[PDB]
Design a protein around this ligand. Sequence first.
Ligand SMILES: [Zn+2]
Lengths: 29, 29, 29, 29
Amino acid sequence: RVCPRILLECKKDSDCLAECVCLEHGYCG
Amino acid sequence: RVCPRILLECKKDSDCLAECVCLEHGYCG
Amino acid sequence: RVCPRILLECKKDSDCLAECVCLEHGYCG
Amino acid sequence: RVCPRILLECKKDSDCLAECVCLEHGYCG
Ligand SMILES: [Zn+2]
């Protein structure tokens, strides 16, 4: 899985880069 | 992101297939 | 990268499953 | 598939970034 480790807040996966997922702490990972 | 539509429980991401991740509700997605 | 190893002929990546790519021998990989 | 738009030569897939693969023409893609 490709998820650059850029710190980004999110509500949905579409708020995230690449194949990062929106995790339960409100950040992409 | 490639995450099969297979119902799987998980404690860690490693429990999941492909690029699915372990969500805190206790299932892969 | 997620590429199921199902034998499939191709001309383009869109002929392939998942994140398989169309390789120079004419099969997905 | 996540393959950065970065010009890279390669002898093997391992030479490439992310989910890029080594094409026989000698570049990642
Ligand atoms: Zn991927």
